[PDB]
Design a protein around this motif. Sequence first.
Motif, short mmCIF file in Angstrom:
data_model
loop_
_atom_site.label_atom_id
_atom_site.label_comp_id
_atom_site.label_asym_id
_atom_site.label_seq_id
_atom_site.Cartn_x
_atom_site.Cartn_y
_atom_site.Cartn_z
N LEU A 1 88.80 73.61 9.30
CA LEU A 1 87.40 73.21 9.53
C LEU A 1 86.84 72.27 8.44
O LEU A 1 85.72 71.77 8.58
N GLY A 2 87.63 72.05 7.40
CA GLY A 2 87.19 71.23 6.23
C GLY A 2 86.13 71.93 5.39
O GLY A 2 85.23 71.25 4.83
N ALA A 3 86.17 73.27 5.39
CA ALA A 3 85.21 74.11 4.66
C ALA A 3 85.85 74.66 3.33
O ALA A 3 87.09 74.68 3.17
N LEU A 4 85.02 75.16 2.43
CA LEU A 4 85.48 75.57 1.10
C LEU A 4 85.26 77.11 0.99
O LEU A 4 84.14 77.59 1.12
N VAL B 1 68.92 72.54 3.58
CA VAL B 1 69.73 71.34 3.34
C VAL B 1 71.06 71.51 4.15
O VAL B 1 71.86 72.47 3.91
N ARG B 2 71.24 70.62 5.12
CA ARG B 2 72.42 70.70 6.02
C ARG B 2 73.58 70.05 5.31
O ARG B 2 73.40 69.01 4.62
N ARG B 3 74.77 70.63 5.45
CA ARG B 3 75.95 70.07 4.75
C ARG B 3 77.08 69.80 5.74
O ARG B 3 77.28 70.59 6.67
N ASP B 4 77.80 68.69 5.52
CA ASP B 4 78.93 68.31 6.37
C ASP B 4 80.27 68.77 5.79
O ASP B 4 80.44 68.82 4.56
N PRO B 5 81.28 69.04 6.67
CA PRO B 5 82.60 69.41 6.13
C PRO B 5 83.42 68.19 5.65
O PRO B 5 82.95 67.05 5.73
N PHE B 6 84.63 68.48 5.20
CA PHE B 6 85.64 67.45 4.74
C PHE B 6 85.15 66.49 3.61
O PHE B 6 85.17 65.27 3.78
N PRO B 7 84.84 67.05 2.44
CA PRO B 7 84.65 66.14 1.27
C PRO B 7 86.02 65.52 0.96
O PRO B 7 87.03 66.03 1.47
N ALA B 8 86.05 64.52 0.11
CA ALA B 8 87.24 63.73 -0.17
C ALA B 8 88.37 64.62 -0.68
O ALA B 8 89.55 64.46 -0.33
N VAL B 9 88.01 65.61 -1.50
CA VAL B 9 89.03 66.46 -2.11
C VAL B 9 89.84 67.22 -1.03
O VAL B 9 91.05 67.40 -1.17
N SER B 10 89.15 67.72 0.01
CA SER B 10 89.79 68.51 1.12
C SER B 10 90.73 67.58 1.89
O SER B 10 91.91 67.94 2.15
N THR B 11 90.25 66.39 2.26
CA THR B 11 91.04 65.43 3.06
C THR B 11 92.30 65.02 2.28
O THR B 11 93.40 64.96 2.86
N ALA B 12 92.16 64.80 0.97
CA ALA B 12 93.31 64.31 0.17
C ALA B 12 94.34 65.48 0.09
O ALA B 12 95.55 65.29 0.25
N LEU B 13 93.85 66.71 -0.14
CA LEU B 13 94.75 67.85 -0.29
C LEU B 13 95.53 68.02 1.05
O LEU B 13 96.75 68.27 1.02
N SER B 14 94.84 67.93 2.20
CA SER B 14 95.53 68.07 3.56
C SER B 14 96.66 66.99 3.70
O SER B 14 97.78 67.28 4.16
N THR B 15 96.35 65.75 3.31
CA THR B 15 97.36 64.67 3.32
C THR B 15 98.55 65.01 2.43
O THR B 15 99.72 64.80 2.82
N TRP B 16 98.28 65.51 1.21
CA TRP B 16 99.40 65.86 0.27
C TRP B 16 100.26 66.98 0.81
O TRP B 16 101.51 66.94 0.70
N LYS B 17 99.62 67.98 1.42
CA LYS B 17 100.37 69.06 2.09
C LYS B 17 101.24 68.52 3.20
O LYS B 17 102.37 69.01 3.41
N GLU B 18 100.73 67.55 3.98
CA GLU B 18 101.53 66.94 5.06
C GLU B 18 102.73 66.13 4.49
O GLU B 18 103.87 66.20 5.03
N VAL B 19 102.48 65.36 3.42
CA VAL B 19 103.53 64.52 2.79
C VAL B 19 104.65 65.42 2.27
O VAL B 19 105.85 65.11 2.37
N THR B 20 104.29 66.57 1.78
CA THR B 20 105.25 67.51 1.15
C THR B 20 105.73 68.64 2.06
O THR B 20 106.56 69.46 1.62
#
Lengths: 475, 483, 483, 475
Positions: B171-174, B448-467
């Motif tokens: 969900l791109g949540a923390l 204050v409404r907040r959106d998911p997937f900050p840059a850190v989450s997206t980059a970590l998902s990419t690194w998990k996929e690469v590895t």
Amino acid sequence: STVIKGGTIVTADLTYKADVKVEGGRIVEIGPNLSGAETLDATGCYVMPGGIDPHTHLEMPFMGTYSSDDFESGTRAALAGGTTMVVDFALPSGQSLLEALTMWDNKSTRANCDYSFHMAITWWGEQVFNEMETIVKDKGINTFKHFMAYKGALMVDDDEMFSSFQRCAALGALPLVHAENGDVVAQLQAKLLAEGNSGPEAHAYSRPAEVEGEAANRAIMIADMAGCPVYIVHTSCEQAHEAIRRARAKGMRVFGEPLIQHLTLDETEYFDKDWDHAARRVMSPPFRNKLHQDSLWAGLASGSLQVVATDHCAFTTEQKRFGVGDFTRIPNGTGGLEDRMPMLWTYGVATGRITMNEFVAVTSTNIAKILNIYPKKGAILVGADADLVVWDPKRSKTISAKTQQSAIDYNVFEGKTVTGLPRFTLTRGVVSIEEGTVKTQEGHGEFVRRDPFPAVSTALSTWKEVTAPRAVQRS
Amino acid sequence: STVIKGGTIVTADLTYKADVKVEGGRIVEIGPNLSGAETLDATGCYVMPGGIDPHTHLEMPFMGTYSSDDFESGTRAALAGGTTMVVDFALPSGQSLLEALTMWDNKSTRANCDYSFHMAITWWGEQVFNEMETIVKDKGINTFKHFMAYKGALMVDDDEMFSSFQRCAALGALPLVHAENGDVVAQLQAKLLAEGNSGPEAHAYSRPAEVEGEAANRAIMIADMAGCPVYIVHTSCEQAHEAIRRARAKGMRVFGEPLIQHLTLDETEYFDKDWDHAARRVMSPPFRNKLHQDSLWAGLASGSLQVVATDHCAFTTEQKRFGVGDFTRIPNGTGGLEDRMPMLWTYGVATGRITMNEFVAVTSTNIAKILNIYPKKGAILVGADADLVVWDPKRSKTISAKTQQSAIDYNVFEGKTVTGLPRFTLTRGVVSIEEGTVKTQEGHGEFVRRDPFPAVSTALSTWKEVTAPRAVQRSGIPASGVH
Amino acid sequence: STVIKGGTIVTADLTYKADVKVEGGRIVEIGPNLSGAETLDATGCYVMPGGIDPHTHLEMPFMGTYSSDDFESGTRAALAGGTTMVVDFALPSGQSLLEALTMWDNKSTRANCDYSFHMAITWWGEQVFNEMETIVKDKGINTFKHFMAYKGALMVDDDEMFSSFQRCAALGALPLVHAENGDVVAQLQAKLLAEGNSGPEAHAYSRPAEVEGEAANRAIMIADMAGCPVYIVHTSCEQAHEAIRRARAKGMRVFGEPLIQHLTLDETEYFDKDWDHAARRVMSPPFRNKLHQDSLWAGLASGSLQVVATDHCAFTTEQKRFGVGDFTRIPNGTGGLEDRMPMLWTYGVATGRITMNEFVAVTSTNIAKILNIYPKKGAILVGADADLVVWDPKRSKTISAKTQQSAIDYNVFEGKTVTGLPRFTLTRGVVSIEEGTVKTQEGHGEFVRRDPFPAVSTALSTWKEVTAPRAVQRSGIPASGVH
Amino acid sequence: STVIKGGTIVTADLTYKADVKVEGGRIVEIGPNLSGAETLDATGCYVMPGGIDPHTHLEMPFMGTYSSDDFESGTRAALAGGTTMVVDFALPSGQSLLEALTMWDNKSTRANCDYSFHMAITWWGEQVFNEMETIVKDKGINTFKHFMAYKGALMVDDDEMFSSFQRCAALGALPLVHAENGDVVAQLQAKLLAEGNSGPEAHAYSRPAEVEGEAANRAIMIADMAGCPVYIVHTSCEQAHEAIRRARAKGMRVFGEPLIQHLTLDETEYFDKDWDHAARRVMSPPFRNKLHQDSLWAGLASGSLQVVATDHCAFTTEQKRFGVGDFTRIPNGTGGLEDRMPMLWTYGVATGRITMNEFVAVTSTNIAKILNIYPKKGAILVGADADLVVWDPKRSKTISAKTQQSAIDYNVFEGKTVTGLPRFTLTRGVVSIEEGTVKTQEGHGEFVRRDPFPAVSTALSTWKEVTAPRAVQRS
Ligand SMILES: [Zn+2]
Ligand SMILES: [Zn+2]
Ligand SMILES: [Zn+2]
Ligand SMILES: [Zn+2]
Ligand SMILES: [Zn+2]
Ligand SMILES: [Zn+2]
Ligand SMILES: [Zn+2]
Ligand SMILES: [Zn+2]
């Protein structure tokens, strides 16, 4: 009497040239220029305490099935490799610890060398709590094995483990732990199968090194809170080693046991194109990235890891094939009893990674002290059992399933060269191996009784009392 | 418009002299010699983003009662200490996440400044799995809180946590975590009571620092396996800090939040001869040996701990006294909303332990970025909300319950001197504090409404996929079966 | 013969009840129900190898004067506290190592127990290079001491140390190191004097724990490059311990020696309002913040620190007073010979911090093995020297200068209570102490000759050879020159 | 004006879609829907601060000789790789710092982008101590470089370094350190040559990773005692990284700078059978075992290493051949200016190892803040210099010496594929690169003056005063 003549004695304590005289299954004299009716030639050799391998699973019921090395073939393999004692895990099903112990006594009839048991705590409740006292005080068993993995089969949780460790502390017993996070493993196994990633290499993928490092750290914290030492079986990776090192740097009493497989083999075996080759090496914890080996070897040299073992659990290729199409169904285990000391000597002593004294410490003496049976076992001293190996540092072979004692059809050390092998192995003075001649005596091995409260446990209890927090006095 | 005139702007990014012009709740212009209809005199002052305290428990049902600062008094206390946003924890319960959210909306109608929520996952099942999606995608909440302790009340286990963290990753949540081993803590509490060790100090004895270090290290492993970052709330000791440092040294995305209480107060409070004095400080994790403070400060300076918070959960002395004779019944929690920024400024900035830019980073900007709401919050930039504190580095007081905004009868920072306090605090351009004059407006604060997937989450998902480990392609896979 | 009857034998290897028979200076028999011409009653006692303290400075020329315990009084003090061997440091000087050795032979003629020497390398050159061979091969000394501080007096630099350590590796000898950064210490001393900060506490201020951690880490790197083990004398702080732990975790052969002073005393001694009281404790490395003690104890328990010693270097108060007005002139050093084993037993064994076997290991057996003289010393085995202490775990006293053997006028362990003291101390079978009756024999002690190449050195040389980086074989190596 | 249109802005602070308007060499406006007379198409691109590479040696006199990239070719290579500023080391011979600075001003005539200098402290004495004040207060240079290695050429000892760091603390300047133990290196070099182990790979053998880790730890201790931050140039290995991490965990102000070469290349290059191939990669510190790369990358993600650089010092194959038969005579250095950002983007950003914001932090913003020239450099903010790169994440090439800007005949990144390259590079608003079209302006680059006492230095001095030990008051 029998005199082992012309050799250099090596113990964990010292190295010196002397003859050893054996009578009535005991060492009776050690000195120069000894004479006996029977002489074993140890010229050019090192005379050491017989190896003790405290991690075996002979004739084990596990994962729908039974291991293919039993007490006779496991103890015969051990002796051929310079090992003169095994400690096997007694494994209950809500079955009684006492019933399980009776079953393990029955399995051990045909033992060629002496043997003892650890008792596994595979569930928790009032019966278990009560029976632990009987096992310690009446049955001569001072260790309890816990599994943090094998969810739905053998696993206990933090609450049960804490209760059991408190009981071990009260009884002067030592908890052993198979440290992997079972909840994470069970989910990763299911996720990999769902994705169709179901081959033997996915066993390794299902339980990465971080899962073992976490579980080891958690077992250490629980034992610290309980006031007992703790022994981390099959420490395979830097993450588990770091947890032990960090605990020991705080003064905690934590022991660690790298398998010979984890010192000398690696996960690239799982990437082999031959399905059998890869499945044969499936065990838990799996063979790891080769980068982890250096950490384990350093631990042996510096004293942060104390005991080398094998977790000997042997399955035929046919049994490993149970897991075709589903890695969770491949029986976990590799054998190593016969190859432990030969591998450790060639890759550890001949390379200078460990001294000969350290080699004795991590192959017999340390575990003998940890299980509170030194100097009966693990010693070359007058009055000690004559469990001895005469080690010829020049006797060499290529390890092969074609020449092994193990009853299975392959060997994970296949093709490794070793230089340094038993010229003789004696079990309580009975010469059971002479070079390649196997002359083991079925039923010779006897159960070794162990007492609770070694020095380390007594001191730790005192220190916990000195440091116990006190109520503040108020009006 | 309103111009904040003659001050030095300090953000996490830089320090410079400029005026700030505010219009329609937003910063509209930054530069020299600005003029407007209203002027606020910031001469000799530092103009910083309003504090964001992401760790509050306002009117929270807990341990047989409710915390005694609510949304109104907590947000008033926050504004008085330079803090212009709070993030509170919505707590279900087997009660729907959506019913808990409605309850928390209802609680927050009198807030004086803006606010958001974390959603706690206090049980696990299909309904929770499903509702997490709605919370993230429809309800503007991108964080989920997990308790590893409070057994029998709020605690989840490794299996539940791993399921939840994998759902966070998707969900791109923390995930946020209260990291103490709840099973060990429950047994140690029972053991101490059985021994007659029942006073407030035994609260600390029941949960020593090792149990926090273990749980933090465990939550980090589970997040690493799920492929999401993780946030360790109230990191109080070197053992928890060491677990974060070791994980970050491996490149793991792990955040840590020391409380101002744990930076500046210590366990000797529990050894006081006065029962009330000791019980007032009972919270979890407890105040620790003072030796641990240096580690937490060093984390702020070096970036291994990124957020200062208060875990503001206030009880009156008479509420604390529910636990006379039984420390397990002392409602756990202390307050600090109004004192966070003043304490950190006097004991961190004035001493040189952190720079003024670091001070901004760990009191607003880092958490804004962690929660994916920068630069709307935690910024002084054109277009940002006009949540601002004009900070007078010479304005001083001794902290005292006699003068505090908090509704409770004591203050754990009683007697601490601070030099450096708000001259003005603005929430979306509304001047709500003016030099010790409190002029807050109930209901001014908005969610204050907040959106998911900050840059850190997206980059970590990419690194998990690469590895990601791949199957080995084989032919002639052998026969199987039981023979 | 003499039989030690009815005691429990405790060695580093095991604990068991047996009598010990002694003849001709050696243990000749160990077993039950032994009898001989003379009997020593060891009922209720532990019978252990006599302590070996490898760190003494008896009648040492230092800082304008000489230490005030000599070979006679130091060995008498040692025997009274259960210690039956000392190893002292022979100090040259551009003076020959061989002339220094002769001088130290001359100093040691009245020793009451046996003794050996380390040779200090206080300068570097061809003569030193050559003479090291003679020291190792002909003079029975297999250790060489290097000072990284005492600039202008004893200090060597990285280049000298690396040359010396490579020569140690070649000879099978072990380098010892006083690890503090001498260049930083010299500048900090001068800076503090210039500021008027000239009292005994400024000694500690001039050499903070970071300067010891750095130097220890440096000596370890140089020994790793030379392919020899290294021994870090008086490891006093967590920074030096961390350097040893990190090196051993890499498999490096590094030994560490905490002093009993650093295990049980602390820098607050320097803050005493009495100048004499503070100056009496001035030594290098200084007493540290008490927080460091736990680290050193943990090293003893876990094996990362292997030897307890005293660095016995005693000065009278009036000698310490050479430094009134200038702490750089206070002769550095404290005494502890007589108190080492009693302090360690009461504060380590009785508290459960170390077992009795560990106690033996860190007070005799480990150093015997490190110096390659086990089992002649540090053993209870048939054939071993009869250096024995019969230790009564109930015999108690308050330590006091009024009753001590040391020739100086005070004792840094003044007022410490100990329970557990020698009933008998034997040096090569000569009963020299009998329950507080001192009956030492001047000149009884003899020099203990030591051989090079213990197992650890030989194994490390083999590992270096196995891992030695090799040239790459290439053909058609290109043309060179300046074009 | 010029508008960079349709792109996504990425800074160290945030990411957002906006146009950027440039006039008079500065950013004058940032917002949506901007219009200017000239438009640069940034659709599908990321608009970032131009790279700052603070570690160059252009036209350097070193090891008997001069580097083969000068200010013109080095700054042209930098721009082609998205880098818009270089900081070069001014290198005195008992020669004056002020004389050395005049010589470096003379070398920098023909610079295509802006530039600054560090001043090297290559010896110690009253003149140096005096001149440091002039360099800081009058010459706009706030960094001093120290060498712990290059014995007999550039090396200073602990006593000199401590004196110099105290002076840097007093002046609000930052010491940079080349951290290798020079005494150990000089001896190992001599030992290897004596043994006949004289080939290019023996350069690596002469200075193992432990030598750098020791020297970094020692520089950190000296700076802590002096009360100044310290910057460890070219951190290449886990040992150096661990020293920095351990210091930073204690609150120490220590910066670390991994080279792109050490993130992405390794010591197996030295084992190549071709002599030239191996010699071309000789630099100090040498390429390391590949196992060290993961530690450096983790440092970039977690903030324990802050700046990526190249240590650009380029020599022709003919120059590298000076060292045939003696590795100590091979000029040390590899070039990387043009390949830094392209390599870091492909292997760091596209893989997810670092975010785009972290990529900006470690390629421009962090160093701009460390050298106290943010937001003039390293920013996309109104009023900042228009030093900008428009980065096309889809523009790809194989790196080759056949197509590089560097004047030498090889490239150590030869054959590496990169996807993500400059579409445009602007230096103070001058478009100097459009895709493969190089249109640099010799002499356009100007010296960037820097002020002493950034916030980190001021705070540290205050903290040292708060914690300073005091005399005990006695009677
Ligand atoms: Zn297991
Ligand atoms: Zn097993
Ligand atoms: Zn909490
Ligand atoms: Zn909370
Ligand atoms: Zn010393
Ligand atoms: Zn000394
Ligand atoms: Zn360099
Ligand atoms: Zn350089």
